[PDB]
Amino acid sequence: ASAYQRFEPRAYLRNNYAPPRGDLCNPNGVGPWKLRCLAQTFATGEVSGRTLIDIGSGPTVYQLLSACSHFEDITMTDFLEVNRQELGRWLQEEPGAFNWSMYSQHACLIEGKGECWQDKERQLRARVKRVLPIDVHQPQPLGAGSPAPLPADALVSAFCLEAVSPDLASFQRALDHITTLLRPGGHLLLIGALEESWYLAGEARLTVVPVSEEEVREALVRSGYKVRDLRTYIMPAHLQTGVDDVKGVFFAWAQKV
Amino acid sequence: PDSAPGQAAVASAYQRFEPRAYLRNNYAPPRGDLCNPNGVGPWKLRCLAQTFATGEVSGRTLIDIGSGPTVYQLLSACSHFEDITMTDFLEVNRQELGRWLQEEPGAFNWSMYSQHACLIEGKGECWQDKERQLRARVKRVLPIDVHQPQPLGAGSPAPLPADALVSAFCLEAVSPDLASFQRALDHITTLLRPGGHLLLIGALEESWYLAGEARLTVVPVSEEEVREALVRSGYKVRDLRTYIMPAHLQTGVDDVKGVFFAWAQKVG
Numbered sequence: 001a002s003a004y005q006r007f008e009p010r011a012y013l014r015n016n017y018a019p020p021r022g023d024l025c026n027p028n029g030v031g032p033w034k035l036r037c038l039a040q041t042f043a044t045g046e047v048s049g050r051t052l053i054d055i056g057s058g059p060t061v062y063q064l065l066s067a068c069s070h071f072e073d074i075t076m077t078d079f080l081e082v083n084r085q086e087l088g089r090w091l092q093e094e095p096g097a098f099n100w101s102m103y104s105q106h107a108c109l110i111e112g113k114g115e116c117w118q119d120k121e122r123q124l125r126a127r128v129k130r131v132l133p134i135d136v137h138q139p140q141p142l143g144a145g146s147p148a149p150l151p152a153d154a155l156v157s158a159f160c161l162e163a164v165s166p167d168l169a170s171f172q173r174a175l176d177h178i179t180t181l182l183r184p185g186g187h188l189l190l191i192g193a194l195e196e197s198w199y200l201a202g203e204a205r206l207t208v209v210p211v212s213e214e215e216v217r218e219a220l221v222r223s224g225y226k227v228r229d230l231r232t233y234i235m236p237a238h239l240q241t242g243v244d245d246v247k248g249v250f251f252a253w254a255q256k257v
Numbered sequence: 258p259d260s261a262p263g264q265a266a267v268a269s270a271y272q273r274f275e276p277r278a279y280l281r282n283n284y285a286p287p288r289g290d291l292c293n294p295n296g297v298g299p300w301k302l303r304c305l306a307q308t309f310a311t312g313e314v315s316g317r318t319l320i321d322i323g324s325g326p327t328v329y330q331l332l333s334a335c336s337h338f339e340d341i342t343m344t345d346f347l348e349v350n351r352q353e354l355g356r357w358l359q360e361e362p363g364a365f366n367w368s369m370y371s372q373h374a375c376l377i378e379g380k381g382e383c384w385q386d387k388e389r390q391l392r393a394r395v396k397r398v399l400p401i402d403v404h405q406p407q408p409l410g411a412g413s414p415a416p417l418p419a420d421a422l423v424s425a426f427c428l429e430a431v432s433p434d435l436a437s438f439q440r441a442l443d444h445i446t447t448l449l450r451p452g453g454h455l456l457l458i459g460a461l462e463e464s465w466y467l468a469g470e471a472r473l474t475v476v477p478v479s480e481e482e483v484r485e486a487l488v489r490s491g492y493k494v495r496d497l498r499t500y501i502m503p504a505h506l507q508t509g510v511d512d513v514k515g516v517f518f519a520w521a522q523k524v525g
């Protein structure tokens with residue numbers, strides 16, 4: 001884990017959410033695919049409630065753009081203080097915040113409600129109530145007496161579990177840990193890297209457990225979920241850049257039973 | 258009656274027209290705020306998008322009459338016409354358009370309008386691609402005077418006759434009275450092929466507006482006067498809608514009471 005102490009948010013953001021990966025004009029790219037998975041899932045109207053927790057948010061907000069209109073109380077989390085600060089800069093509109101507006105605009109485009117991207121960002125900022133430390137390796141990831149309303153009605157988590165677990169067994173336990181935060185009958189939207197073993201974040205070099213779609217499906221089942229949806233995006237050559245060795249991205253919609 | 262004097266008054270007044278002040282007055286918040294679906298900006302873009310979505314308005318060439326320094330009126334049009342001519346009476350406006358065509362930082366930022374057009378067109382198009390296509394399809398920017406029998410002049414570069422005309426907030430803003438407005442419509446109608454389409458946007462019951470130091474005179478027209486002018490010029494009126502300006506959009510930049518949108522097809 002000590003590897004994460006060198007994690008640089010700006011390098012991470014540049015590596016994954018600036019062009020080419022962060023170019024949203026091409027409908028066949030990874031960004032549009034991710035936003036589409038999230039928007040379509042929420043458009044079913046089956047993922048609803050009052051409170052939601054985003055697990056391992058890092059310095060990003062794209063994962064909550066479609067979610068925020070369905071949950072009035074949102075908790076964002078990360079293991080690193082520098083990531084929580086980076087989030088704070090965007091949430092508070094402070095100087096030097098990352099520019100997420102391309103993602104916000106595309107979410108509005110995809111959702112098709114004629115919403116301006118400014119209203120969308122306003123709603124997300126308003127509904128994110130708190131940003132908390134978290135460690136998915138702990139039986140109680142949020143600790144003993146957290147300000148977060150528990151259990152949550154829904155969880156979101158993108159590119160975290162596989163990125164912090166040495167092997168499949170560790171991946172499984174981490175999922176078990178965060179699953180305790182979710183109310184029975186609640187929903188988990190999980191996004192992650194397929195068959196990845198490393199990625200870079202400035203001076204940090206992070207180890208990743210390479211997982212397959214079937215392995216993800218089986219882990220969700222073992223954690224007591226019914227898998228409602230599980231899709232794969234295969235990474236095209238033009239998005240394989242040397243910041244990592246990712247082969248694909250998965251999206252899972254799972255419901256706790 | 259004699260038209261020269263009134264037209265000289267107009268030409269003189271426009272020598273003080275300031276494009277930047279005009280842009281700010283009309284295409285920046287609150288009027289340029291596109292978030293409220295009940296606002297005038299979204300209404301205009303909607304009228305244009307819905308008209309082009311019928312598929313009924315297409316062809317090869319289009320002429321925008323009295324573009325001024327604005328491009329919003331062509332955002333939905335540009336996907337249907339490979340050759341677009343923009344025009345204005347004033348060099349300073351043509352220069353403004355030039356800055357935007359060159360994608361210069363000093364140019365007015367139309368991205369809020371571009372994004373909204375992509376939003377309502379519903380094709381998942383990114384605004385950068387929309388702006389790139391408009392820039393590619395603008396083939397020329399020319400002087401124009403709608404008061405001349407040949408508004409573009411003799412032997413113009415523009416492909417004539419055009420398959421379609423667009424014109425926003427021009428005719429009523431440059432005509433001393435209704436008689437002049439009618440003649441101006443007659444003049445630009447010579448530029449359009451029989452069976453071609455005109456999309457006309459304009460101010461209802463307006464008598465003045467500001468563009469910096471310049472306070473410009475406008476002929477107050479009603480919806481029925483607009484409809485009759487179109488019939489008189491030889492159009493079938495396919496659509497004529499009215500937007501009533503809410504009080505919070507009456508900002509002291511003008512005395513406009515409403516905005517009209519007309520879709521008309523030249524008989525022939």
Ligand SMILES: Nc1ncnc2c1ncn2[C@@H]1O[C@H](CSCC[C@H](N)C(=O)O)[C@@H](O)[C@H]1O
Nearest residue numbers: 056057058060079080134135136158159164
């Ligand atoms: N033990 C732990 N428990 C929970 N999160 C951790 C963790 N160790 C590292 N992390 C966080 O896991 C994140 C992986 S990067 C993914 C960030 C963001 N959700 C995205 O979609 O881009 C980093 O922000 C890292 O700080």
Ligand SMILES: Nc1ncnc2c1ncn2[C@@H]1O[C@H](CSCC[C@H](N)C(=O)O)[C@@H](O)[C@H]1O
Nearest residue numbers: 323324325327346347401402403425426431
């Ligand atoms: N005699 C004339 N013939 C054609 N256009 C004229 C004219 N006299 C002034 N104009 C132009 O009429 C425009 C009115 S302002 C409207 C500009 C733009 N089409 C819009 O939608 O915001 C100005 O650009 C002005 O320069």
Ligand SMILES: Nc1nc2ccccc2[nH]1
Nearest residue numbers: 016021030031159193246
């Ligand atoms: N952490 C992370 N974010 C990504 C976005 C697109 C493709 C691969 C990615 N890995």
Ligand SMILES: Nc1nc2ccccc2[nH]1
Nearest residue numbers: 283288297426460513516
């Ligand atoms: N020239 C001009 N542009 C306008 C935009 C909205 C309402 C009135 C307007 N008059």
